[PDB]
Amino acid sequence: GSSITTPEEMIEKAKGETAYLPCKFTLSPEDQGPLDIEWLISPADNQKVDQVIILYSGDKIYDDYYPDLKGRVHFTSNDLKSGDASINVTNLQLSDIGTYQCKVKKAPGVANKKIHLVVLVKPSGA
């Protein structure tokens, strides 16, 4: 019933650099529910596991408003209503490491895909 491109994913970027996370949800006359996007992160290095950091609901893109990863996990899509729910992480870092879950909620089709953020070693940057 649902349709999502690149579900399970792994992204590796240099610390301090922005890590792009692509999410493309399919559109259909059926998807009459409000457009929604969600991102959970589980830091392998940190004690944290599965926590909300960036979301997009009610036309409000949440990332900077969200304490978790505020100011970084920014949707590169300036027109998410086009099916693009992608968010990139600004100013990467070692603690940013951790599995990411991209879930686009749009009735009657909830989209969910995996994105693992891996940070390569490089100068501070953060």
Angstrom distance (rounded) from CA 110 to CA 97: 25
Question: How far lies 38's CA from each of 15, 45, 126, in Å?
Answer: 23, 22, 24
Residue 64: CA atoms inside 13 Å, Cβ hemisphere, count?
Answer: 8
What kind of fold does domain 1-126 have according to CATH? Immunoglobulin-like (2.60.40)
The answer to whether 60 and 51 have CB atoms below 8 angstroms apart is no
How were these coordinates obtained? NMR
Supply 53's token pair.
Answer: 């950091």
